[PDB]
Amino acid sequence: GLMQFTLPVRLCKEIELFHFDIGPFENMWPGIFVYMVHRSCGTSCFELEKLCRFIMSVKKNYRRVPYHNWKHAVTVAHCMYAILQNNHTLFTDLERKGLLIACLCHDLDHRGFSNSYLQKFDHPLAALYSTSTMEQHHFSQTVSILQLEGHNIFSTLSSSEYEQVLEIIRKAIIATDLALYFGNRKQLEEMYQTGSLNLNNQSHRDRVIGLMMTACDLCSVTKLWPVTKLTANDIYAEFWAEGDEMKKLGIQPIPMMDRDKKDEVPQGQLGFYNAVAIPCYTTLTQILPPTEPLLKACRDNLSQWEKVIRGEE
Ligand SMILES: Cc1nc2ccc(N)cc2nc1C
Ligand SMILES: [Mg+2]
Ligand SMILES: [Zn+2]
Structure with missing residues (x-):
């Protein structure tokens, strides 16, 4: 119980910043996650025996794909950490518990293909789950691992606290379905602007956790430019494998998934920053002012992509 996880000095300082990269040493990632649970939640939130067993079973159930991998899990969870640490007083003990676990679990057993390709x-999985196919699957895998002997990190919670946290994790994982993000943010937009946004209303909390989940999930666009640019190669490697598979089913894929159309990537990223990322981090900064460093980093990376188009790189 008096066993604190610690980090080397550079990490101990950088981990607190939104643009932290967890590094190329796979074996440090579990201790990075536990470090974040201990400071976000307490050394008490989880029995360390069960947490570690849980973390290693989750690692095992992420596949060896270019992007939707164990590194993405820990990276999305670190963004959620940065958010929760910059908005201390706005979240319940249960939400702090649930959300770091939702983030680590949010892409369990991903194969690197979209809901559309499924x-x-x-x-x-597409007969079992007609909308948010992969995300209903990721939630199913999460429940499965929670039910393995010695893996129930929530065992100490009340029957009703247990139901509440599992409901936070489910809504949090379904929200990562980017097809759901547009309407969710349009609604948060109106609610914030017309003045009816209310964090005591559970349905409004649900929406705001959803937007946070989208923000954490897209956090590649909020890093330093060389991390953003190198992650985008992993992202496109899956996109082109999916477009190849489309071609194999006799369907011309969208250009964004066509490896014959790499020339259009910089313009495709512009659309993505303008249609998705910038609006996401904007509404997030309005609802949660301390998250502005994510909007600023996202704007800096749009300008780096504009520079790629203008052939200055
Ligand atoms: C950088 C990036 N580009 C994308 C392009 C398209 C898409 N559907 C999702 C994307 N997600 C990220 C994180
Ligand atoms: Mg996902
Ligand atoms: Zn994800």
């Missing part, structure tokens, strides 16, 4: 392939 529906066109006619994958069984």
Whole structure:
């Protein structure tokens, strides 16, 4: 119980910043996550025996794909940490517990293909789950691992506290479905502007946790430019594998997934920053002022992509 996780000095300082990169040493990532749980939640929130067993089973259930991998899990959870640490007083003990676990679990057993490719392939998961296919699957894998002997990190919570946290994790994981993000943010936009946004209203909290989940999930666009640029190669490697698979089903994929159309990537990233990322970090900064460093980093990276187009890189 008097066993604190610590980090080397550079990490101990940088981990507190939104643009922290967790590094290329896979074996440090579990202790990075536990470090974050201990400061966000307490040394008490979890039995360390069960937490570590849980962390290693989650690691095991992420596949070896270019982007939707164990590194993405820990990276999304570190963004959620930065958010929770800059908005201390706005979140319950249960939400702090649940959200770091939702982030680590949010892409469990991802194969690197979109909901669309699952529906066109006619994958069984697409008969089981007609919308948010992968995300209902990621939530299912999360419950599965929570139910393995010695893996129930929530065992100490009341029957009703247990139901509440599992409901936070489910809504948090479904929200990562980017097809749901647009309406969710448009609603937060109106609510904030017309003045009816209210964090005592649970349905409004749900929406705000959803937008945070989208923000953490897209956090590649909020890093230092060389991290953003190198992550985008991993992202596109999956996109082009999916477009190849489309071509194999006899469907011309969208250009963004066509490896014959790499020339259009910089313009495709502009759309993405303008249609998705900038609006996401804007509404987040309005609802949660301390998260502004994410909007600023996102704007800096749009300008780096504009520079790529203008052939200055
Ligand atoms: C950088 C980046 N680019 C994207 C382009 C398209 C898409 N659907 C999702 C994307 N997500 C990220 C994080
Ligand atoms: Mg996902
Ligand atoms: Zn993700």
